[PDB]
Structure formats: C-alpha cells, structure tokens
Amino acid sequence: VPQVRVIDPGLCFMYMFLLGVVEDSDPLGPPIGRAFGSLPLGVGRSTAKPEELLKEATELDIVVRRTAGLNEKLVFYNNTPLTLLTPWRKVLTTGSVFNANQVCNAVNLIPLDTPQRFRVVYMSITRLSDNGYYTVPRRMLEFRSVNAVAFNLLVTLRIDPEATFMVHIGNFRRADYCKMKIEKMGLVFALGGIGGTSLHIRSTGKMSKTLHAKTLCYPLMDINEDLNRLLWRSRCKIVRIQAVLQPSVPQEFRIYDDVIINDDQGLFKVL
Amino acid sequence: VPQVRVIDPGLKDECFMYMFLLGVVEDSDPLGPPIGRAFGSLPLGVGRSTAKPEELLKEATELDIVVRRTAGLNEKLVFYNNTPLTLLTPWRKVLTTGSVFNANQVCNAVNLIPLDTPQRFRVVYMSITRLSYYTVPRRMLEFRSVNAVAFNLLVTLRIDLPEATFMVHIGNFRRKEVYSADYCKMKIEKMGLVFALGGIGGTSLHIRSTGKMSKTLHAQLGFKKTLCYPLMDINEDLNRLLWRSRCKIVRIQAVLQPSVPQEFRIYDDVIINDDQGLFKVL
Lengths: 271, 282
What we know:
It is classed as viral protein. Two copies of one chain form a homodimer. By secondary structure, chain A is α+β, with helices and mostly antiparallel strands. Chain A folds into two domains: 132 residues, no CATH class; 139 residues, no CATH class. The first copy, chain A, is built from seven helices and 15 strands. In chain A, the strands form three sheets. In chain A, strands 1, 2, 3, 4, 5, 6 and 7 form a seven-stranded mixed beta sheet that branches. The first copy, chain A, is elongated, with a radius of gyration of 21 Å. At the A-B interface, β4, β5, α4, β8 and β9 of A face β4, β5, α4, β8 and β9 of B.
C-alpha cells in the first residue's frame, strides 16, 4: 500500500524522494518486478497535502531505461501530465540520469529487451527553508594534504539494530584543547531524507576560518550508497556522534593514530 | 585455506602481472579475539615477477597489513604493510607507501569496521592477471552529447548455473538518415572486437579491436590497444559478489542508445544480437 512520510530536520520548499518497483510495462505480459529503486526529484515549493502529492505520484507513468557511462545508470522520465507535482516538472519531463547503484538495489536484473516502468509505492518529503540545500563540493571533501589532520565524525544511527557512517568536516594544519575548540563551533545535527537518509549540520557558535564549511547537507547516498539503500524505508535516529581526528594523506596513517573524542562537554546537539 | 588463481586474458615475455588480494578485515589487538568484521580486497597493481604463484601467495599470507577506516566524499579504507618484502618487492609502492580506496569497492561492510580497535587485513586468496594496462578516462565515459548515439554492450557472465549482466560504454557517434539493423551489424563486424575476462579489481572485461576502426565512432579503441573495463568501476556491488568465483562470457549484445537523458523519450534502444561473429570471446 503506498505511504508518505514528512521529515523536518528543523535547523514552503520541500525535497521529494520516491521509492518504487522497477517492473515490466508491456501489457501483453505480467508486471514482473525486476528491482526496487528510488527517484530523487529535488526541491520545489508546494502547499499541497502530503497525501494528495502521494496520490498523484502513484498515478504517474514513469519509464526506466538502463544505460551505461563510467558505471551502470538509470534514466527516468514521466509520461503523465502534471497538476500538484508541477514544481518538480524539470526532473519529471526533461528526464534524468542517475548512478544505478545509488537509486537501485539490482540494476543487473533490469532487462534491456522489455520496456520498464517505475511503479511509485512510497514518498518521502523533507521540509527546507532556502529553496535547495548546501552540500560541500566533491573536490573539497576528497582533498588530502600532507601534515594535516582531518576533522571527521562517526555517527551512529538506531534503525527503527544500529548502523554507523563517517562524515568529513574538513582539514587543519598539524589533546583536551581540541575537545574545547569543537565545543566552541556549536554544532547542531538533524536527520533528513535527501537521497533517502541525510545528515544536516549547522554551526551555531564560532569557527576559526574553516572555509570548507550556514547549514550543510551530507546525503548518505554519497557516503555509503549501499547502507543508504538498506535504510530506504526505515525510521532512523542519531544515538551517538564521536569526533575522529585522523591523518589526511595515506602515508601518514602509519605515523599518526586516530584520536576519538566522545561528547561529554556539550560538543554536539541532536534535534 | 589460502588459494591462488592465475588468469590470462590472452589478447609478451616481460612477465608483467596485476596482483589482487582478498581477505578478512579483523581485530588485531592481541588482548581480544581476531573477530572478523568484514570481507575485503586489496588491489596491488602491476609488477614484473618470475616467482611461482604459490610462493607469492605464501609471502602475501605472512604480511602484517593494517586497515584504517576513514572518510572523504565517501567511506574509505587505508591499507599499509608492516612486514619487510622479498618476492613482493615489485608491489612495494602500494604496500609500503600505503593506499586509500573507496570502501564500497574494496569491502562488503565498511560500517562494521570499528574505529576504537586496531584492524588487520588477513590475506586468504590471491588472483594474478598476466599482462602483455589501458583504461578509458572517467571524463570520456561519463560524457553525454546532444544528437549522439551511445555504442554500448550488454555482457552476460555465467558464474561457475546463475548468470549476471553488466553494461559497458564503448563510445559515441553522431546521429545522422537511419542506419539499418544490417548496416550497424556490418560496421560492428568490421571492427573485429575480441573479448576476454581478467581479474583487474576482481573481475574485468578486456576488449581489443583487431579489425578496422570506424571513422564516425568517437572511442578510445586504438589500432592495437587493449581496453580494460574493471567491474569495480561498472558495478562495484556485483564485482564484490563475483570476488571469489570463476566467470565466463556467455553472451554479448550491442545496445545502441541515446546519450543525453532528454532524448530517451524520443529514441528507442536498438539491440543487436551476436550472430555473424561481431564479438569473438577467448
């Protein structure tokens, strides 16, 4: 039965994410389910009831086409004229391409010789305030520097079992003083549904010229796509955040050990 | 029990070979048990060696390799070795300097590797691929062009029985006129594509065009260049699933598709099944 969930991290606009079944659409054969997948639609303004947006999404005729680039890809495009979902018409009518392993549990099972549809079965809406969200650019997150210390976080979620994931905040040039500096940042955390499951961080306090990091979104789709697929239709809660200071460049992992900081001085606030 | 496999795609007497290890990420503190956290891999790269595979395996199993979980854009695993080398000296750059990998490409469950306990990579299996490698750059494979036709391949493997398919992107060509089913089939046949499996990153596809290359196809298939397509890049999840299994190519189909997503609505896929010997499998 289709269901809708509204998530408000709380740190008009709303990010819409659909979950559904990739299945055969030829009316001469059965609608055989090939894979379970997702369709991130992005941000858009809407004052419609979530149950009304869900009802329209379930009535859409969405086509899935498997293709390749560097890796397996899925192209999604819609055939049904829109009414309440007109804020997301750019993605639905222009069509979009995704990394298949990020939006699909088994792309290798989707056939090329038989037309496919994406039967929407579930919707997730994340309430926002800027008409989008801010993410750290890929080049900044992937950058490694000699004689630097990476400020990372190990976040533990309780799945309503536990699951952990690591986040990279930034780097600093190379003790109890670090625990106080992190407290001075005034970091606040919340979960969202950007790409399935996402972490939202906002620094309410003071920062010493970070330049990498006012609210950052860290979608689990980018951090660990496999775990993100596993948590697609589950309620999550942050139950622990630990700071993990580590070396940046791999040749320095031999020289410098990790320093794990546990929150005992109001370092991190979870909403 | 540790085992070693030698794979020869067969597409030189210089003894160049790619080494790839499989093993268990486990607790290394001697005060606690060696609890297995995750199964993973360690691609070591290319190196010259005339040592027996069983001798290279024996040395690899004796190495003290440290695993350190970390983050960037995504979950990472850093591997570095503590044991002095003898036969594995050709792979000393990766082993001594240390290397970082995308955890989902070299590990089945990175979220299960703890940060509060030292970790080790206990080598349990080795895979050597004999070489005479070249890969298409990421920017070329990911590039999408308006009014273009992507020349892709759907490869089916039999896991020695169950099957698995994967798609490969060869190159793009301008959309003109409509090429017939027999015209494109004839052009593909003229390329003389030859295929073989290797072990680059676990499982890999090796393509060589022995015939004449199309003057209209924008691809990196040179006159006598062997392109390597590691399944680690194509479908990292399927590549992990096939880590310790024998594979065989049982079907190759050409799939001509549009390039930009807005053209999937307008143009359909054209599947060209292998008859006439478009694709030779070794």
